[PDB]
Amino acid sequence: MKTACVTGGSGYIGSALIKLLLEKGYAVKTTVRNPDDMEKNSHLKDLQKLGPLTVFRADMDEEGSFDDAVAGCDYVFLVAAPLHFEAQDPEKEQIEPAIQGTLNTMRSCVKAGTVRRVILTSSVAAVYFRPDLLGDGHGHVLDEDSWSDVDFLRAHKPPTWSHCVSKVLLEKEAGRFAEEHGISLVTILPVIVVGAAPAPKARSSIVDCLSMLSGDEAGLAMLRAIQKTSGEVQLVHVDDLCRAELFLAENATANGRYICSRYHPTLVELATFLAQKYPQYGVKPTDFDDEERPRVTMSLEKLIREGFEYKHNTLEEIYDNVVEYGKALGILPY
Amino acid sequence: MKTACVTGGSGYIGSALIKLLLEKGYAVKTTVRNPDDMEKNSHLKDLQKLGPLTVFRADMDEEGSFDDAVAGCDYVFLVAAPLHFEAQDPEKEQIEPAIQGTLNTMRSCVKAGTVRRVILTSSVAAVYFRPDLLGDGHGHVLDEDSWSDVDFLRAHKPPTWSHCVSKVLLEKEAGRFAEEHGISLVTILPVIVVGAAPAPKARSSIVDCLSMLSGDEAGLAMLRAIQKTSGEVQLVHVDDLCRAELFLAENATANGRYICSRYHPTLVELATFLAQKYPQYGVKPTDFDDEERPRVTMSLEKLIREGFEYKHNTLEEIYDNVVEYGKALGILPY
Numbered sequence: 001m002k003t004a005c006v007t008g009g010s011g012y013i014g015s016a017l018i019k020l021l022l023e024k025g026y027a028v029k030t031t032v033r034n035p036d037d038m039e040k041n042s043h044l045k046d047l048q049k050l051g052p053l054t055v056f057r058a059d060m061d062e063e064g065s066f067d068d069a070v071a072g073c074d075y076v077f078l079v080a081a082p083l084h085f086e087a088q089d090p091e092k093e094q095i096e097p098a099i100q101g102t103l104n105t106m107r108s109c110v111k112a113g114t115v116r117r118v119i120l121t122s123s124v125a126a127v128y129f130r131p132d133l134l135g136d137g138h139g140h141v142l143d144e145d146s147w148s149d150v151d152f153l154r155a156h157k158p159p160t161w162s163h164c165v166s167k168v169l170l171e172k173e174a175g176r177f178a179e180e181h182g183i184s185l186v187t188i189l190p191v192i193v194v195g196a197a198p199a200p201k202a203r204s205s206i207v208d209c210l211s212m213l214s215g216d217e218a219g220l221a222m223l224r225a226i227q228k229t230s231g232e233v234q235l236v237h238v239d240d241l242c243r244a245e246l247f248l249a250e251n252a253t254a255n256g257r258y259i260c261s262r263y264h265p266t267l268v269e270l271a272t273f274l275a276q277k278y279p280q281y282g283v284k285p286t287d288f289d290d291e292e293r294p295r296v297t298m299s300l301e302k303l304i305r306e307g308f309e310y311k312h313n314t315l316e317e318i319y320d321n322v323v324e325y326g327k328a329l330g331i332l333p334y
Numbered sequence: 335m336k337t338a339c340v341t342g343g344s345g346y347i348g349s350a351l352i353k354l355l356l357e358k359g360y361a362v363k364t365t366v367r368n369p370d371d372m373e374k375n376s377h378l379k380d381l382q383k384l385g386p387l388t389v390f391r392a393d394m395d396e397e398g399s400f401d402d403a404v405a406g407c408d409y410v411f412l413v414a415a416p417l418h419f420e421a422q423d424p425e426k427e428q429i430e431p432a433i434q435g436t437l438n439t440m441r442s443c444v445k446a447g448t449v450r451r452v453i454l455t456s457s458v459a460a461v462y463f464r465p466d467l468l469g470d471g472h473g474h475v476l477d478e479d480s481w482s483d484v485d486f487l488r489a490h491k492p493p494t495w496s497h498c499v500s501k502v503l504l505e506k507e508a509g510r511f512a513e514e515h516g517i518s519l520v521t522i523l524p525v526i527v528v529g530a531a532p533a534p535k536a537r538s539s540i541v542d543c544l545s546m547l548s549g550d551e552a553g554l555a556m557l558r559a560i561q562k563t564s565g566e567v568q569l570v571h572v573d574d575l576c577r578a579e580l581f582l583a584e585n586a587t588a589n590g591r592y593i594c595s596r597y598h599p600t601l602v603e604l605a606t607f608l609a610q611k612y613p614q615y616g617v618k619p620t621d622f623d624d625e626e627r628p629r630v631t632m633s634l635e636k637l638i639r640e641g642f643e644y645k646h647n648t649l650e651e652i653y654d655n656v657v658e659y660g661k662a663l664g665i666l667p668y
């Protein structure tokens with residue numbers, strides 16, 4: 001009955017969100033960059049079996065190309081995002097495109113006239129970078145009023161700086177635009193996302209949350225960096241993320257931005273669990289021993305306050321199906 | 335101006351509840367077993383400088399003795415509770431009298447005819463003892479549907495068994511009674527309570543949370559027992575518990591039982607924080623190193639879903655003032 005658009009149907013979170021929407025009885029429209037690439041989009045034919053799913057070609061770099069996909073939709077889930085750290089001139093190759101691609105899609109929402117709410121998928125990368133609070137030696141609970149320090153990041157350009165800046169600025173810009181055109185925009189801010197999805201060529205979070213099993217050095221360094229900063233990592237099941245996105249679309253009183261997170265283990269806790277549950281990978285939990293650090297953690301309360309309920313609540317439930325996904329994707333060798 | 339009764343004004347939580355009630359403009363009646371004991375009850379004189387405070391004598395074993403104190407009260411906070419010392423017949427000396435004493439006070443609430451709500455202070459001792467969830471080696475999140483297993487406890491009588499059975503049965507019987515007599519009963523279930531209160535003789539109530547600084551062997555054993563069971567401990571600040579109790583009395587939609595908890599450190603996290611903030615006590619965090627264990631934790635969501643907010647959200651804030659209190663009580667030498 002109601003219709004929704006999901007940008008980046010070939011993506012990890014995008015594919016999972018399409019599945020939820022179809023299961024929930026939505027007509028769905030999704031965009032990919034090359035609808036003919038079955039290497040990336042073989043899942044779309046399968047998803048079509050669950051309900052009305054229509055595929056469009058669109059590129060965030062190409063103005064107006066989202067017009068057709070967004071037309072008629074009651075809800076638009078802005079999931080697709082450049083990402084890809086690369087380097088060189090991040091300001092012109094990551095940040096500016098990130099901002100413009102977002103406004104590109106926003107304008108299609110205005111053109112459609114039908115869009116009752118836009119859900120923007122951002123990231124706690126736009127929340128956590130508070131150099132006043134990291135390194136003061138105290139614990140902190142960061143909430144939705146916390147914004148990553150764009151000025152400090154541009155001045156000092158630490159690792160992943162363009163990523164946090166991209167997210168902060170595209171969120172601010174989309175909110176300004178939504179303000180100006182009287183469109184309702186809600187933003188969700190996930191932590192590390194765990195779990196299986198329809199997408200056949202995903203990597204993204206799966207590499208990181210599986211890095212103790214694969215030994216992938218980039219993912220391992222990412223996990224250790226988060227813990228050295230926060231004293232913990234933060235995790236959420238992809239299906240809870242998708243349900244939170246739909247919750248925010250459907251509940252009229254939802255407003256502003258929302259952290260989405262459920263379980264906050266130390267790496268030693270996470271490695272201990274993984275080594276017991278999946279001994280075939282040889283995880284050594286002592287590889288992740290660390291002194292206790294003050295906790296700089298994310299508040300889970302806003303979604304809870306507004307009535308949302310997570311279904312994957314223990315560490316084991318958060319890891320209920322990601323290993324098999326990683327195997328199928330070749331991220332894990334067996 | 336509404337009027338509220340707190341049973342057991344001499345006690346740790348009771349004195350803190352009275353203080354909050356006066357600050358929020360309530361007239362307060364409280365009970366002690368010997369109003370003439372001004373050593374034990376000096377704080378009640380002090381608190382009278384905040385607002386109307388009236389002391390009554392009453393005893394849970396003495397039928398009717400609470401009549402005068404609850405009379406004319408809008409709300410009644412049932413806080414008083416027996417200390418519980420190893421008894422030859424726990425059923426006859428502890429469990430049955432805990433039920434009867436609770437009913438005794440319930441009756442006085444009915445008799446008053448004015449009691450909008452009764453708030454029962456209990457504890458997660460009535461929640462956590464689950465032979466399946468504790469022994470199955472998996473992580474779990476317990477919520478307010480979880481009750482300690484009275485039959486298993488009577489069958490195997492582990493340590494503290496009588497304390498849990500007492501809490502479970504007295505809560506069940508008080509709800510039975512409240513149903514039949516048409517009086518609203520809400521129950522709060524705190525975890526370990528930390529922080530300063532007005533009571534001058536409350537030594538025994540904060541022994542555990544300071545045991546790392548004091549070396550109190552009984553307190554250390556309790557902390558380790560809980561960690562052995564749950565993989566962590568659970569803490570809440572006494573002032574958040576008091577604020578939660580007031581919230582549950584004042585908000586008509588509140589119903590049933592509520593866990594009250596905020597911060598769940600491992601012992602090594604707790605010890606590390608204490609060692610650095612209060613080095614003068616020679617805490618050795620390595621004394622508390624431990625294997626990562628499946629987390630059997632408490633859900634914090636019910637109070638949050640209903641709009642309550644905690645003010646002591648970091649480990650440091652939860653410990654913001656308890657050390658000075660322990661000095662004043664003589665738990666800590668300096």
Ligand SMILES: NC(=O)c1ccc[n+]([C@@H]2O[C@H](COP(=O)([O-])OP(=O)(O)OC[C@H]3O[C@@H](n4cnc5c(N)ncnc54)[C@H](OP(=O)(O)O)[C@@H]3O)[C@@H](O)[C@H]2O)c1
Nearest residue numbers: 008010011012013033059060080081082123192193204205
């Ligand atoms: N995964 C996590 O742990 C996590 C955590 C926090 C936040 N998030 C946020 O959630 C969003 C989706 O994350 P993901 O893990 O699903 O990443 P993903 O699998 O790489 O999906 C990203 C999608 O964006 C599309 N895309 C990129 N540039 C495009 C362009 N110019 N035009 C059209 N489409 C374009 C991509 O299509 P192509 O494949 O054709 O390039 C891809 O399908 C991201 O914004 C992420 O930052 C994720």
Ligand SMILES: NC(=O)c1ccc[n+]([C@@H]2O[C@H](COP(=O)([O-])OP(=O)(O)OC[C@H]3O[C@@H](n4cnc5c(N)ncnc54)[C@H](OP(=O)(O)O)[C@@H]3O)[C@@H](O)[C@H]2O)c1
Nearest residue numbers: 342344345346347367393394414415416457524525527539
């Ligand atoms: N302290 C914590 O960390 C914590 C944590 C979770 C739950 N709780 C629960 O909160 C409740 C209050 O705890 P608390 O720490 O405040 O203990 P407390 O300081 O010992 O206060 C309990 C009060 O009960 C009174 N009392 C005992 N028997 C009585 C009787 N027969 N008649 C009248 N009064 C009687 C006592 O007054 P007398 O001096 O006259 O005996 C005492 O003041 C308890 O049920 C506890 O189980 C406490």
Ligand SMILES: O=C1C[C@@H](c2ccc(O)cc2)Oc2cc(O)cc(O)c21
Nearest residue numbers: 123124125128191192204205208226
């Ligand atoms: O954008 C983010 C945020 C990042 C993060 C998590 C926790 C934290 O405290 C800080 C940053 O984790 C991620 C992990 C991914 O695989 C892909 C992502 O896009 C991201």
Ligand SMILES: O=C1C[C@@H](c2ccc(O)cc2)Oc2cc(O)cc(O)c21
Nearest residue numbers: 457458459462525526539542560564
């Ligand atoms: O009633 C309880 C329950 C106990 C507890 C906390 C957490 C847990 O997981 C299990 C039991 O903590 C306490 C600590 C006290 O000083 C006094 C108490 O009366 C109690």
